[PDB]
Amino acid sequence: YFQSNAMKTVTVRDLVVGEGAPKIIVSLMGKTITDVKSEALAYREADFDILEWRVDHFANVTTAESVLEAAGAIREIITDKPLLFTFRSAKEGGEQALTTGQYIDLNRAAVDSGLVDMIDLELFTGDDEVKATVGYAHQHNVAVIMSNHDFHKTPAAEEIVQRLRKMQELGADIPMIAVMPQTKADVLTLLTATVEMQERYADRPIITMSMSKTGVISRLAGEVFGSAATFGAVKKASAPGQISVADLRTVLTILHQ
Amino acid sequence: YFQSNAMKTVTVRDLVVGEGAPKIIVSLMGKTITDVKSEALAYREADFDILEWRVDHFANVTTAESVLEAAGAIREIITDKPLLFTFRSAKEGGEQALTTGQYIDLNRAAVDSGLVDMIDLELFTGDDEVKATVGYAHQHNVAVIMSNHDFHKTPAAEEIVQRLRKMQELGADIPMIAVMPQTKADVLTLLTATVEMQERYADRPIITMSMSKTGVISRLAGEVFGSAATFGAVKKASAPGQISVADLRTVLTILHQ
């Protein structure tokens, strides 16, 4: 993959994240290899840019062989889209829990497989562990989306910016933050932080969102405010506020014009 | 017309402004009677809710009979959409100048015609004459959109809110403000003022917009943030940032559903 600090872009495959209209990410959440393959097949007909595999939804996550088998199955079905490997931790709202060591080993195994283009690492996993794993990913030509989630509130704009800057400091290729609005003002706080980060500090693409139906604007206005990607739902949403993939592309295309 | 402070609505004909998805306004901008008639024909296959006649684009505005005939010509083409009579003053970006007295007489004549459902009165016309004209419009069953426009900058949110509050105080059925963003933050300023005024405070619908391409998101997000209507373009836009009416309705429907 490539990255430019001037264009503030990350290029994975031929996809240029940070240029033009925001890119669409869709999450695959199957429990079994059968569910993963059927979802992948169904998704192939959809118009998205990046496939996020939510590995925390996978029952056999603790069996190394099974994870590799599922990654391979996805790659065989969805052959022309970057594959993002994401174990969302229990701490940050994931479907199952792993020790820090297990979580880092899981991500290292994904990097080593050569089957995934990007991995998601959580900002608050631990500095030593994050830096070591970012380095390992980079040594293997795998990009890192570094993430943070607040499912119950929206921190101050200053705190949101501080977290995004810390992700940059840790070597994140793409800093990403998702927060929960409790008011309409909270949605605008997330957008304010997005504009501030993108205009003042970012030298790479960032991804931001205010969850829930109230925060939907944050999933649509990335081109003007400075969010490089957005999540859409093919069937079931991976988080509240996501709109259908078809509708999402329609809105982004309208805004790009 | 009707109006309710329960649901913060204004009902003109069967159209309920302030309920559900934002309503769409399009502007008619012809120089002569036959120009406005031809434009009205062009607009008839478009999906919009309210027809704004931009009377300041009309060459013979000082000839009362000409203005009446033009209003009549419009109503011959467009029979199923409320007609909003708007002379945008030179001071606020209009295409020609009229004295305050001429402007007030023009609006009173529009009210008397029985051909217009609504009139636009500018907040900064003069408080006393605005109050008197609002009273006259109301006595003749004509609703009033009270407006303010800043085509060059975005005032502070507190100032935007003060203006919207003053419009309520002066009797506006629908306060309306349009401002010009010079930075991305300015768009957020306009949305912030929209929420501050509208959310659990205003007792009637309001219309707000951040103009230009940078502010287009403000024309789409009214259902969440609190703007009851939005302007689109059929052929030529009447202000920078308006997108096609078809595209506008597409996004509004996506966000309502």
Ligand SMILES: O=C1C[C@@](O)(C(=O)O)C[C@@H](O)[C@@H]1O
């Ligand atoms: O980080 C994100 C963001 C997300 O939470 C959203 O709100 O769209 C959806 C998750 O699957 C993904 O890992």
Ligand SMILES: O=C1C[C@@](O)(C(=O)O)C[C@@H](O)[C@@H]1O
């Ligand atoms: O008040 C408005 C708003 C507007 O300026 C706009 O930005 O859509 C278009 C004008 O025709 C109308 O009178």
